[PDB]
Each structure stands twice: as C-alpha cells, then as structure tokens.
C-alpha cells in the first residue's frame, strides 16, 4: 500500500538517522580520544605492577561496520524523456 512518494520520505528519515549515527560516533571524545571512530585497545594500568592492564574494547560502528550504507526501500520509477524546444514561424 505505501506509495513511492511515501518511500521517498521514509528513505529521507532513514538517511538522516544514519548520518546521525555516523556523526555521533565519528566525533565524540573523552579527553581528545575518539572512542568509536577507530578500533583499538585502551590499556588500563590498574595496579602498581607493570602488567596490570585491563583493556577496554571497540568496534568501528559507523555505517559501513554496521553494514547500513545501502538501505533502499524506494522501489523503482519509470522515466520518460520528452524533447523540449522553441518553435519558429520560419517556413
């Protein structure tokens, strides 16, 4: 039942939500450290001893890591091309 003019608006919402989960993970930081932008290990020195490191863990969660770069619920359209011109009384 949903028309394709409906699916255009739903796709506009979905791309805005995915741009937003790309932004809020791309630029968020505790003390200049981008937590979700890249995957790496943060080691915590939790002890006076040298190996007392508890390592927190991360996954790139952007739209490509989650696999939401392609989301089309927009169906299909048929395009007709009609030539446009200016007429002339030159006969």
């Amino acid at each position: 039942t949903n028309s394709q003019s409906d699916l255009d608006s739903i796709q506009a919402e979905i791309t805005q939500r995915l741009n937003e989960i790309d932004r809020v993970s791309g630029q968020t930081q505790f003390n200049g450290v981008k937590v979700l932008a890249q995957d790496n290990t943060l080691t915590i020195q939790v002890g006076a001893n040298d190996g007392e490191t508890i390592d927190i863990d991360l996954k790139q969660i952007n739209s490509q890591t989650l696999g939401l770069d392609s989301l089309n619920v927009q169906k299909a359209y048929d395009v007709k091309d009609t030539a446009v011109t200016t007429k002339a009384y030159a006969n």
Binding site: G32, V33, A37
Partner: protein, 51 residues
Amino acid sequence: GGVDATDANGAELVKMSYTDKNGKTIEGGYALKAGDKYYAADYDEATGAIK
C-alpha cells in the same frame, strides 16, 4: 648552526602543524626546512625577516 651549506641553501620557510594520532592538528611556529630536518626559525609578519 647546522647541517651543510648545500642543504641549507635549499631549505625554504614552511609553517609547522603537528597532528596527533586522534585527529586534531596542533599548529606550531615557523621553521626552516633544511634538507629534511626542521629549523626553528621565526618569521616576522612585517617585511620578510626570518630570524
């Protein structure tokens, strides 16, 4: 002060800008790029004095 005359003649003024691992770039002072070393040279806005 440093390197060699041939390399020194070659170097031209460039503005240094250090970049961390994270992603924000910190801007530093001027330098004299002699060879591939960086020289802590100071550029004055007025005239062209490179100290």
